[PDB]
Amino acid sequence: SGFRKMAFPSGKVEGCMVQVTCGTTTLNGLWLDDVVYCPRHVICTSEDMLNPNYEDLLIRKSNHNFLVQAGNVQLRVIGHSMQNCVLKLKVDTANPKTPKYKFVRIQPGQTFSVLACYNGSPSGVYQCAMRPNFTIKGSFLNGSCGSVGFNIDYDCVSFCYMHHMELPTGVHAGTDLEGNFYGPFVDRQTAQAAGTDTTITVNVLAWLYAAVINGDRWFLNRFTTTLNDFNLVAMKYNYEPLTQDHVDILGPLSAQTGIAVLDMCASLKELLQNGMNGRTILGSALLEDEFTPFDVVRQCSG
Amino acid sequence: SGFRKMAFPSGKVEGCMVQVTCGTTTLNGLWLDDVVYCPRHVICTSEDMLNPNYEDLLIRKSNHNFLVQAGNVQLRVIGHSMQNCVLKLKVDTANPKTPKYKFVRIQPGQTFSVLACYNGSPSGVYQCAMRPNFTIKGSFLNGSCGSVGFNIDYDCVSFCYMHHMELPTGVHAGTDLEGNFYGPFVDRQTAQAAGTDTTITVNVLAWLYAAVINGDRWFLNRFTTTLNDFNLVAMKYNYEPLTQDHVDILGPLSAQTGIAVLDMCASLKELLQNGMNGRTILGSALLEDEFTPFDVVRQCSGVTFQ
Ligand SMILES: N#CCC(=O)NC1CCCCC1
Ligand SMILES: [Cl-]
Numbered sequence: 001s002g003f004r005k006m007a008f009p010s011g012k013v014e015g016c017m018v019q020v021t022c023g024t025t026t027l028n029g030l031w032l033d034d035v036v037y038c039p040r041h042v043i044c045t046s047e048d049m050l051n052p053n054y055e056d057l058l059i060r061k062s063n064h065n066f067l068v069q070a071g072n073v074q075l076r077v078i079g080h081s082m083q084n085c086v087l088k089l090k091v092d093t094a095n096p097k098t099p100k101y102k103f104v105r106i107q108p109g110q111t112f113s114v115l116a117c118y119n120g121s122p123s124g125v126y127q128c129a130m131r132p133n134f135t136i137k138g139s140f141l142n143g144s145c146g147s148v149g150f151n152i153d154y155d156c157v158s159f160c161y162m163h164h165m166e167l168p169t170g171v172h173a174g175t176d177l178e179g180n181f182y183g184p185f186v187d188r189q190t191a192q193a194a195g196t197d198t199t200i201t202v203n204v205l206a207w208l209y210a211a212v213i214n215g216d217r218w219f220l221n222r223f224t225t226t227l228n229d230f231n232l233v234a235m236k237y238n239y240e241p242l243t244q245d246h247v248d249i250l251g252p253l254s255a256q257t258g259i260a261v262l263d264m265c266a267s268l269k270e271l272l273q274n275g276m277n278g279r280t281i282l283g284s285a286l287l288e289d290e291f292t293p294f295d296v297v298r299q300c301s302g
Numbered sequence: 303s304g305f306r307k308m309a310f311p312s313g314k315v316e317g318c319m320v321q322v323t324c325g326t327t328t329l330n331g332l333w334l335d336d337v338v339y340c341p342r343h344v345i346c347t348s349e350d351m352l353n354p355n356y357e358d359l360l361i362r363k364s365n366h367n368f369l370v371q372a373g374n375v376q377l378r379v380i381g382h383s384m385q386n387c388v389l390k391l392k393v394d395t396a397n398p399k400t401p402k403y404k405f406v407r408i409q410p411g412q413t414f415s416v417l418a419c420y421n422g423s424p425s426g427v428y429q430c431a432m433r434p435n436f437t438i439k440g441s442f443l444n445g446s447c448g449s450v451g452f453n454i455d456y457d458c459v460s461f462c463y464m465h466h467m468e469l470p471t472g473v474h475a476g477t478d479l480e481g482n483f484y485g486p487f488v489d490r491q492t493a494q495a496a497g498t499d500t501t502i503t504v505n506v507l508a509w510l511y512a513a514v515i516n517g518d519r520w521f522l523n524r525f526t527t528t529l530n531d532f533n534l535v536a537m538k539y540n541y542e543p544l545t546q547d548h549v550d551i552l553g554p555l556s557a558q559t560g561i562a563v564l565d566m567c568a569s570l571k572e573l574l575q576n577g578m579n580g581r582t583i584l585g586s587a588l589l590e591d592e593f594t595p596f597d598v599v600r601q602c603s604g605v606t607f608q
């Protein structure tokens with residue numbers, strides 16, 4: 001029993017974190033086989049913040065301009081190339097700790113673990129979710145760029161996020177491991193603002209199902225709703241639209257608990273209307289939206 | 303910016319996790335040097351659990367009755383002995399991945415990272431606090447016994463918890479790595495209940511400081527208070543008493559933010575008596591008490607471990 005915000009064990013990713021230095025800038029790199037991946041803005045100077053021409057800045061660099069340090073060991077850079085907003089540094093040594101891995105670009109609402117690192121060394125691991133506005137609500141200090149987000153399927157590491165910058169509202173933006181930013185953001189210091197964020201409705205419903213599995217039913221009701229009436233109500237609370245795709249995803253959790261998906265939708269509508277009235281659900285006085293249906297089944301069933 | 307419930311990087315402990323099987327029971331063991339540590343109730347059948355005599359149950363077992371698997375490699379048990387509620391299995395091979403480590407016993411209100419394991423394979427990591435009633439609000443399924451809790455202090459892993467059982471209320475109980483239970487619990491299938499819990503006051507204050515660092519300031523007010531006055535309110539609301547040592551520990555946060563500790567206690571006094579009034583603090587409608595002052599300093603400064 002119990003339900004916690006659970007991250008993946010970080011050891012497989014820890015063995016891949018290195019430090020990348022270019023000029024006076026130092027951030028984190030991801031060392032997989034004989035390639036080190038890091039944000040391309042490591043090559044920017046103080047005058048290259050607003051409108052850097054990365055092709056022009058990169059063509060001026062030599063392999064020895066990049067200092068890559070793995071633990072107490074300097075790796076020799078033997079080549080470099082740009083792919084979108086990430087830099088790929090070819091090194092003369094394959095990482096002997098390289099796990100089974102792949103790169104996956106995730107969709108809003110998906111969750112992943114973040115290994116926050118500074119100077120190539122991990123600081124902590126926590127759980128995140130891609131917000132509907134393509135930001136993440138992380139915990140990052142200066143020097144955390146190049147930290148990665150990931151999931152682990154059995155023993156294969158799925159890298160899905162690399163940290164690039166913090167927006168003025170204190171939220172964070174980054175790329176997949178192919179260098180493509182999540183959302184409309186760019187690696188420039190020009191004024192950028194995240195769109196108004198919304199609640200991940202399918203995740204809230206999955207987390208209500210988790211509460212029932214763990215033995216709590218106080219929030220259910222005798223009502224149901226149509227899918228459209230639910231959405232008409234939920235939008236007024238800044239909730240994401242619930243699609244038929246989302247209803248299908250919740251099928252297994254519905255079958256396990258015996259509560260139809262649209263019945264849970266009616267329970268959610270009432271919670272938004274009433275609040276919790278001094279009660280809690282799985283230890284929280286707010287509705288939690290950073291547990292996916294996949295997260296719930298993995299944590300509640302193994 | 304940002305503040306998250308953050309666990310220590312679990313890599314050093316992942317390399318110590320093994321599978322231990324005794325008869326039909328399989329759980330997790332901790333492999334350090336040439337000894338595997340696991341709960342002593344691994345030797346018990348279902349009827350043994352009702353009223354076990356662990357010394358007598360252990361005599362019948364031979365070294366080959368303990369099947370230890372490190373990954374896909376079997377470990378040869380060459381000796382077995384008991385220390386309190388943990389079993390110690392001497393193996394023929396020292397763990398080459400043994401980190402610099404100590405066995406430590408933590409205090410209520412202290413936090414630690416849990417590496418949840420099944421069949422010797424780590425599956426999750428999350429942060430817990432040792433509650434004042436000596437339970438932890440964990441997330442454990444069947445097969446998770448032997449999962450361990452730990453902190454990291456400059457390359458040295460401090461092992462502080464090993465999971466043993468779940469209480470009827472869904473919270474969890476375990477021992478230190480020397481077999482001593484946290485709380486008034488025993489490893490036997492019998493009527494056991496967690497005592498009435500209280501809120502860790504020093505941790506709530508630390509988390510309010512984390513909120514101020516991150517720009518959440520609406521709960522600040524003009525008032526201050528005294529230790530005696532605040533503890534009267536804390537007792538009324540089932541909050542642990544605030545000691546002078548707690549005030550000293552919060553000292554660094556009191557200067558990084560510019561908010562005195564007693565100044566913050568007056569904010570907490572008002573929040574307890576009036577509530578949050580529809581507002582939130584660091585994205586929470588409840589007062590979070592599982593961040594220690596050292597946790598808040600560590601996350602808001604960037605301290606790393608190898
Ligand atoms: N089961 C299952 C699949 C699942 O959890 N789907 C997620 C994908 C990301 C958005 C939120 C829903
Ligand atoms: Cl996805």
Ligand code: NA
Binds near residue numbers: 524525
């Ligand atoms: Na005050």
